[PDB]
Amino acid sequence: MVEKKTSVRSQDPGQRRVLDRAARQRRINRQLEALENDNFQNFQALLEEQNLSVAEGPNYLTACAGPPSRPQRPFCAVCGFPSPYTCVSCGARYCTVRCLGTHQETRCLKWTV
Amino acid sequence: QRIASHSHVKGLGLDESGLAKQAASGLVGQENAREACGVIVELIKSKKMAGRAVLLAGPPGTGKTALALAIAQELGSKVPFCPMVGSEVYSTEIKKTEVLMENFRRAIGLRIKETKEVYEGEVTELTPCTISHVIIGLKTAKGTKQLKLDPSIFESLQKERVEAGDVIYIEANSGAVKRQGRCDTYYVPLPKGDVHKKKEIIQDVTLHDLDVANARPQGGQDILSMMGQLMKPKKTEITDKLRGEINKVVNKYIDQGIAELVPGVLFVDEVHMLDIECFTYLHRALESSIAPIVIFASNRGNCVIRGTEDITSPHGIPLDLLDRVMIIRTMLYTPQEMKQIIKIRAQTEGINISEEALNHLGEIGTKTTLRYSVQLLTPANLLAKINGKDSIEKEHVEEISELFYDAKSSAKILADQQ
Amino acid sequence: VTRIERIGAHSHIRGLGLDDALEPRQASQGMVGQLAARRAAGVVLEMIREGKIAGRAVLIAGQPGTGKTAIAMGMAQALGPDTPFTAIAGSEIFSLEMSKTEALTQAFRRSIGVRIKEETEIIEGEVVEIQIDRKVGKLTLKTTEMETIYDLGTKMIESLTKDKVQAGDVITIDKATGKISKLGRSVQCPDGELQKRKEVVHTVSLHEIDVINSRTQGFLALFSGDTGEIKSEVREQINAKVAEWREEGKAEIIPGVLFIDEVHMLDIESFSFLNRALESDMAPVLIMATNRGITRIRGTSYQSPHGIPIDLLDRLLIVSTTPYSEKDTKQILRIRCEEEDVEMSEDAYTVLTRIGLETSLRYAIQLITAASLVCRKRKGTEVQVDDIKRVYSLFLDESRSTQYMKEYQDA
Ligand SMILES: Nc1ncnc2c1ncn2[C@@H]1O[C@H](COP(=O)(O)OP(=O)(O)O)[C@@H](O)[C@H]1O
Ligand SMILES: Nc1ncnc2c1ncn2[C@@H]1O[C@H](COP(=O)(O)OP(=O)(O)O)[C@@H](O)[C@H]1O
């Protein structure tokens, strides 16, 4: 019987309109907070009492180390192995053609809303 | 690895009393000649004489090269031993006499211990302080150290384009900088030892190497830059000026105990190939107080000297130079000795031989030169191997000797002469 | 259509035609008859391939034209590539930029290979975009299966500046050097992975090591601007450093062959040098060829077999090649015809066989092509007997030419 996906024709990328630059940052930020996030897959109270804690003296906010001297290393994000490549659209890194395939099908451009 | 014609010779094979054994460190037979070589080898170890000369004489194949190599083995690696062919003196860049003198100087060695240190690591910082000095931080797997560096060295750093994160090997005494790469984390591994490496290099040099290093200048950045570009032939050093001055500085360091002289050997093969002007230079040269011991080898008897076109002399060497030389005669082997040599060569070369195969191969060695019996072993073993056998059965030697002829048999074939 | 290499005297020799018991097929791989000598060549060829024994010497002797250079080329072709086979004539060592002894040792050391196995990683793709911010930039590369961005750091962007201001080029980047090489305008773009780890097995002669390390930019091995390497120093420590590469995993040595054709042209200085040059671990096998009988050695007045001094003939094994019968002559002529484009009548083969068995083999082999052309003139398609007779009249051989000196000319 039929190929049975032309009915849903999800992506149909004649009008793809890549997401880039600041959008990448958004994704990065999102991922960071998700790795910093909690059980559900009080934080507002934490942010409130943290914004009470703002000052120039030695405190929570001023105890951040900062950027590292040893430069950032590439990793694949699909299997986590060292990654010679970058995805042209979103900037996330990968190490094979197969990994680019999976990434294009599940993580490239799809979760930027 | 890689067996060679003499690689079974492990020494002269004398005992503690001097007298030669029938078979020893690779060598078998040549009782009297090995005894004579054993006497001169202690002349070499004495480090006392200069320019003493020996002629290993005899027919081709009678072990004379083997005895010279046995001397070289008997001494070890701590004293020089320079192989030359008399044919090598006919240089096209350099006058024969100067090839000969250079080889006389290759054969005198000089041991010298330098306790020396090099600083290596990933450079963490550089700060020059008109520059009074440069502070440089170096990192290895055993920590970090802050170095103060002579400001002249600060030129080298900029010439090598070193900057923080590079791995470098700044040498303490020279001040020489070599940029080994970029550090692994950004390429070469972070050095895994201490940042201040210190070691006593006890490696040795020779007088000729010194002469050559003093023949031509280095660096300069002026007109000299173009001297770094032209074709670089060898040229004669100056007898009564440069190489004598080298003698002076070497004596200065010997007096200080920094260096120790190790007089070696110059071994000249096929000495009959030297020109008569070479022979006469040579017998003006090995009377010098600085010369090595020189071992000559010649495999032809009474015949005409080179470059005279009619003067005939024993061993192809003028009577003048045959005086002031001690002659060691080597002689032809008996069938028993040739059998032993064939056996030693076989077991050196990795070959198994059946007793009847060995006996007939030795008999071949009686109809024909020993060296030919020794030739046949490997191809005969290769046939045996290709017939699936481990040993050389007689079926293989007594048939491989039909594929390959020897000099005499092939000469008899050539006697059809058309 | 026509490449550099064309039909030469030994083109038909595709190998040394032996069964793997080292037994010669009476006609195989272009080689005919000559059984004893060819199987002896087989033994020394397997001894070459074993490699464990250094500095062995074989002399292959016989009349002119009795297959001895053909046997040498058969060994070369049977040995195949990636094992050095340095072929020179005895006349090659007589030189003006270096001495004959030095040229001979250089020939010895072109003939030992060092096999060194190295892993790099190579990028290969079509350029999609490139950037410059006067400096840093970025590069996007495309294989038909993927595209990626790279950051153009200082050395990489400097390297890419060498032949810039174009895009859509399909190029390779060596991540070691930054060496860019471009195949052309997107010739098709590449398949598979963009960046791959890759292995190269370099085989480099000892002469090449020695030359590269003789001098700053000493790699003029391309034009022989070296004039005698510094032996015992820049040549003793290369031997030591190769012995250090070995027995550690860095490299393995591949001992090849040195073929000295017409060794009777060497002189006793050169022969005396061979005596000792054959006796070191780094000595290859050398095989050498000679027509001459018992003749005067060059450089002296001494008569000797093969024109080679006897103390060197002690040092080598002497193969003898033998002259050909009618059958072997006919078969060689057939194989030459099959290597060239010609076809002949069987009567033409018979006539040419007797012609070559009368005068000399090589003359008949030469007549093949001439008769082919003569038949082409009359727009034939197979060489006939009268073509051979015509060509036999047009082109003389040495014997009939000498006979025709019943008239007189200069001396
Ligand atoms: N006394 C010995 N014991 C064992 N093997 C020997 C002895 N003398 C010679 N040989 C072997 O026989 C060969 C004869 O060659 P060689 O001695 O170099 O000739 P020459 O004496 O003319 O230099 C040597 O290369 C060596 O392999
Ligand atoms: N056994 C053989 N098989 C094939 N061709 C041969 C054979 N012997 C000689 N030839 C050919 O005959 C000609 C004679 O040359 P060649 O035998 O190399 O001369 P030489 O033996 O004097 O070196 C060449 O064209 C060669 O290819």
- Nearest C-alpha of chain B: how many angstroms from C374? 34
**Which residue on chain B is closest to C218 by alpha carbon?**
B231
Nearest residue by C-alpha to atom 14 in ligand 2: C65
CATH number of the domain located at residue range(s) B1-106+214-332 in this protein: 3.40.50.300
As given in the structure block, the two tokens for residue C199 are 């292995």
Contact C254, C84 (CB under 8 A): yes
User: Which residues, in sequence order, are bridge partners of residue C289?
Assistant: C60, C261
Is the Cβ of B187 closer than 8 Å to some Cβ of chain A?
A: no
Domains belonging to chain C, first-starting first, are 8-112+205-324 (3.40.50.300), 325-411 (1.10.8.60)
Do the bridges between strand B81-85 and strand B108-112 make them parallel or antiparallel, or are there none, so unpaired? unpaired
Ligand-binding annotation for C65, yes or no, is: yes
Q: What is the CA radius of gyration of chain C?
A: 28
Alpha carbon B58 to chain centroid, angstroms: 24
Query: Which residues, 6+ apart, have CB-to-CB distance to B238 below 8 Å?
Result: none
Do the bridges between strand C137-143 and strand C146-152 make them parallel or antiparallel, or are there none, so unpaired? antiparallel
Q: Is there a contact between B379 and C47 if contact means CB atoms under 8 Å apart?
A: yes
User: Which residues, in sequence order, are bridge partners of residue B405?
Assistant: C318
Task: Reduce the DSSP state of residue C178 to 3 states and report it.
Answer: coil
In angstroms, the CA B82 to CA B71 distance is 12
In angstroms, the CA C199 to CA C196 distance is 10
Contact A85, C123 (CB under 8 A): no
Among the partner-chain residues A87, A88, A97, the one whose CB lies closest to the CB of C193 is A97
Contact C345, C384 (CB under 8 A): yes
- The answer, yes or no, to whether any atom of ligand 2 lies below 6 A from the CB of C290, is no
User: Which residues, in sequence order, are bridge partners of residue C319?
Assistant: C60
As given in the structure block, the two tokens for residue A57 are 């003296």
Count CB neighbours of B22 within 10 A.
12
Which of C16, C78, C71, C19 shows the shortest CA–CA distance to C49? C78
As given in the structure block, the two tokens for residue B262 are 């190790």
As given in the structure block, the two tokens for residue B148 are 């103060």
Contact B141, B191 (CB under 8 A): yes
**Which residue on chain A is closest to B186 by alpha carbon?**
A71
Phi-psi domain of C304 (left: phi exceeds 0; alpha: psi -120 through 50; beta: other): beta
Task: Reduce the DSSP state of residue B121 to 3 states and report it.
Answer: strand
Contact C155, B161 (CB under 8 A): no
Is the Cβ of C64 closer than 8 Å to some Cβ of chain A?
A: no
In angstroms, the CA B96 to CA B83 distance is 16
In angstroms, the CA B362 to CA B409 distance is 17
- The answer, yes or no, to whether any atom of ligand 1 lies below 6 A from the CB of B64, is yes
Q: Provide the residue type at C253 as one letter.
A: I
> Phi/psi of residue C407, each to 5°?
-135, 170
User: Which residues, in sequence order, are bridge partners of residue B108?
Assistant: B263
Atom from ligand 2 closest to the CA of residue C34? 1
In angstroms, the CA C112 to CA C84 distance is 7
Q: Is there a contact between A88 and C145 if contact means CB atoms under 8 Å apart?
A: no
Q: Is the dihedral of CA B358, B359, B364, B367 positive or negative?
A: positive
Which residues of chain C make contact with A86, given a CB cutoff of 8 A?
A: 148-150
> Phi/psi of residue B30, each to 5°?
50, 50
In angstroms, the CA C356 to CA C181 distance is 55
- The answer, yes or no, to whether any atom of ligand 2 lies below 6 A from the CB of C31, is yes
Tell me, letter by letter, the H, E, C secondary structure of C138-161: EEEEEECCEEEEEEECHHHHHHHH
B107-213 domain in CATH 3.40.50.300? Answer: no
Nearest residue by C-alpha to atom 1 in ligand 2: C32
Query: Which residues, 6+ apart, have CB-to-CB distance to B147 below 8 Å?
Result: B119, B135, B136, B137, B138, B170
Which of B345, B371, B303, B361 shows the shortest CA–CA distance to B62? B371
- The interface residues of chain C toward chain A in range 185-244, judged by CB-CB distance below 8 A, are 192-195
Do the bridges between strand C57-61 and strand C317-320 make them parallel or antiparallel, or are there none, so unpaired? parallel
In angstroms, the CA C232 to CA B212 distance is 12
Nearest residue by C-alpha to atom 17 in ligand 2: C67
Cα of A30 from ligand 1 centre, angstroms:
84
- Domain ranges in chain B are 1-106+214-332, 107-213, 333-416
Atom from ligand 1 closest to the CA of residue B30? 1
Which long-range CB contacts under 8 A does B32-39 form with residues at least 24 apart? B32/B329, B32/B331, B33/B58, B33/B63, B33/B64, B33/B67, B33/B328, B33/B329, B33/B330, B33/B331, B34/B67, B34/B70, B36/B328, B37/B12, B37/B67, B37/B70, B37/B71, B37/B328, B38/B12, B38/B14
Task: Reduce the DSSP state of residue B401 to 3 states and report it.
Answer: helix
DSSP-derived letter for residue B28 is B
As given in the structure block, the two tokens for residue C377 are 């003139």
As given in the structure block, the two tokens for residue C203 are 């085989």
Query: Which residues, 6+ apart, have CB-to-CB distance to B107 below 8 Å?
Result: B80, B81, B82, B206, B263, B264, B265, B266, B292, B294
Alpha carbon B368 to chain centroid, angstroms: 32
Which residues of chain C make contact with B268, given a CB cutoff of 8 A?
A: none
Contact C55, B375 (CB under 8 A): no
As given in the structure block, the two tokens for residue C94 are 């007589």
Contact C252, C113 (CB under 8 A): no
Among the partner-chain residues C146, C149, C150, the one whose CB lies closest to the CB of A97 is C146
C-alpha separations of B408 from A31, B413, C307 in Å: 90, 9, 14
Which residues of chain C make contact with A91, given a CB cutoff of 8 A?
A: 149
Q: Cα-Cα-Cα-Cα dihedral of C73, C75, C78, C79, to 10°?
A: -110
Query: What would the DSSP string read from start to end of B91-108?
Result: -SSS-HHHHHHHHHHHTE
Q: What is the CA radius of gyration of chain A?
A: 20
In angstroms, the CA C357 to CA C89 distance is 28
Count CB neighbours of B256 within 10 A.
8
Contact B87, B359 (CB under 8 A): no
In angstroms, the CA C48 to CA B79 distance is 35
As given in the structure block, the two tokens for residue C256 are 């090849």
Q: Could you say which ligand is closest to the alpha carbon of residue B70?
A: 1
As given in the structure block, the two tokens for residue A62 are 């001023």
List chains touching A (3+ CB pairs under 8 A): B, C
What are the start-end ranges of the H helices in C246-359? 268-277, 310-313, 326-339, 346-358
Alpha carbon C169 to chain centroid, angstroms: 37
Query: Which residues, 6+ apart, have CB-to-CB distance to B79 below 8 Å?
Result: B44, B45, B109, B262, B263, B264, B265
Ligand-binding annotation for C66, yes or no, is: yes
User: Which residues, in sequence order, are bridge partners of residue B261?
Assistant: B110
In angstroms, the CA B70 to CA B19 distance is 15
Which of B53, B57, B75 shows the shortest CA–CA distance to B9? B75
Greatest Cα-to-Cα distance within chain B, rounded to the nearest angstrom:
90
- Nearest C-alpha of chain B: how many angstroms from A84? 14
In angstroms, the CA B361 to CA B373 distance is 6
| Cα A106-A110-A113 angle, rounded to 5 deg | 150
Is the Cβ of A68 closer than 8 Å to some Cβ of chain B?
A: no
Q: What is the resolution of this structure in A?
A: 3.2
Label residue C285 exposed, middle or buried (CB < 10 Å: 0-12, 13-18, 19+).
Answer: buried
Contact A96, A77 (CB under 8 A): no
Greatest Cα-to-Cα distance within chain A, rounded to the nearest angstrom:
72
Which residues of chain A make contact with C194, given a CB cutoff of 8 A?
A: 84-85
Nearest residue by C-alpha to atom 10 in ligand 2: C67
Cα of B37 from ligand 1 centre, angstroms:
15
Q: Is there a contact between C97 and B92 if contact means CB atoms under 8 Å apart?
A: yes
> Phi/psi of residue B183, each to 5°?
-70, 155
Top residue of B122, B163, B185 to mutate, by most chain A CBs within 10 Å, is B185
The beta strand positions in C206-336, using DSSP E, are 251-255, 257-261, 285-290, 294-296, 303-305, 317-320
Task: Reduce the DSSP state of residue C247 to 3 states and report it.
Answer: coil
By residue count, chain A amounts to 113
C-alpha separations of B49 from B81, B173, B282, C16 in Å: 16, 36, 17, 58
| 3-state helix, strand and coil shares in percent for chain B, rounded to the nearest 5 | 40, 25, 35
Do the bridges between strand B303-304 and strand B312-313 make them parallel or antiparallel, or are there none, so unpaired? antiparallel
Count CB neighbours of B15 within 10 A.
10
Q: Is there a contact between C146 and A91 if contact means CB atoms under 8 Å apart?
A: no
Report the number of secondary-structure helices (H) and strands (E) in chain C.
13, 18
As given in the structure block, the two tokens for residue B88 are 């090598």
Atom from ligand 2 closest to the CA of residue C64? 22
The gap between the terminal CA atoms of chain A, to the nearest Å, is 36
Q: Which residue carries 């019943």 as its tokens?
A: C406
Q: Provide the residue type at A101 as one letter.
A: G
Q: Is there a contact between B1 and C22 if contact means CB atoms under 8 Å apart?
A: no
In angstroms, the CA B215 to CA B220 distance is 15
Task: Reduce the DSSP state of residue C402 to 3 states and report it.
Answer: helix
Do the bridges between strand C303-305 and strand C294-296 make them parallel or antiparallel, or are there none, so unpaired? antiparallel
Q: Could you say which ligand is closest to the alpha carbon of residue C29?
A: 2
Q: Which residue carries 């005894």 as its tokens?
A: B35
What are the start-end ranges of the H helices in B28-95? 31-46, 64-75
Contact B204, B112 (CB under 8 A): yes
In angstroms, the CA B361 to CA B406 distance is 13
Contact C383, C372 (CB under 8 A): yes
In angstroms, the CA B315 to CA B272 distance is 7
Atom from ligand 1 closest to the CA of residue B28? 3
Query: What would the DSSP string read from start to end of C199-239?
Result: EEEEEEEHHHHHHHTSSTT--GGGTT---S--TTTTTHHHH
- The answer, yes or no, to whether any atom of ligand 2 lies below 6 A from the CB of C9, is yes
- The answer, yes or no, to whether any atom of ligand 1 lies below 6 A from the CB of B59, is no
In angstroms, the CA C58 to CA C120 distance is 41
Query: Which residues, 6+ apart, have CB-to-CB distance to A73 below 8 Å?
Result: A82
Which stretch of DSSP H or E encloses residue C85? Answer: strand C85-89
Which stretch of DSSP H or E encloses residue C172? Answer: strand C169-174
Is the Cβ of A84 closer than 8 Å to some Cβ of chain C?
A: yes
As given in the structure block, the two tokens for residue B124 are 């963490």
In angstroms, the CA C339 to CA B224 distance is 59
- The answer, yes or no, to whether any atom of ligand 2 lies below 6 A from the CB of C24, is no
**Structural determination approach:** cryo-EM
Task: Reduce the DSSP state of residue C35 to 3 states and report it.
Answer: helix
Could you give the count of Cα atoms lying within 13 Å of B327 in the half-sphere of its Cβ? 15
Query: Which residues, 6+ apart, have CB-to-CB distance to C55 below 8 Å?
Result: B4, B5, C277, C278, C279, C280, C283, C284, C285
As given in the structure block, the two tokens for residue A58 are 């030695």
Ligand-binding annotation for C62, yes or no, is: yes
Contact C13, C74 (CB under 8 A): yes
Contact B304, B337 (CB under 8 A): no
- Nearest C-alpha of chain A: how many angstroms from B153? 27
> Phi/psi of residue A81, each to 5°?
-85, 160
As given in the structure block, the two tokens for residue B111 are 């041991």
In angstroms, the CA B42 to CA B52 distance is 12
In angstroms, the CA C202 to CA C254 distance is 11
In angstroms, the CA C296 to CA B188 distance is 62
User: Which residues, in sequence order, are bridge partners of residue B188?
Assistant: B183
**Which residue on chain A is closest to C128 by alpha carbon?**
A88
The gap between the terminal CA atoms of chain B, to the nearest Å, is 44
In angstroms, the CA C141 to CA C164 distance is 15
User: Which residues, in sequence order, are bridge partners of residue C300?
Assistant: none
Among the partner-chain residues B82, B372, B386, the one whose CB lies closest to the CB of C314 is B372
Which residues of chain A make contact with B185, given a CB cutoff of 8 A?
A: 70-71
> Which CATH number fits the domain B333-416, given the four candidates 3.40.50.720, 3.90.1310.10, 1.10.8.60, 2.60.320.10?
1.10.8.60
Task: Reduce the DSSP state of residue B282 to 3 states and report it.
Answer: helix
By residue count, chain B amounts to 418
Greatest Cα-to-Cα distance within chain C, rounded to the nearest angstrom:
88
Q: Provide the residue type at A45 as one letter.
A: A
> Phi/psi of residue C199, each to 5°?
-115, 135
**Which residue on chain B is closest to A71 by alpha carbon?**
B186
Which of C4, B376, B255, B269 shows the shortest CA–CA distance to B247? B255
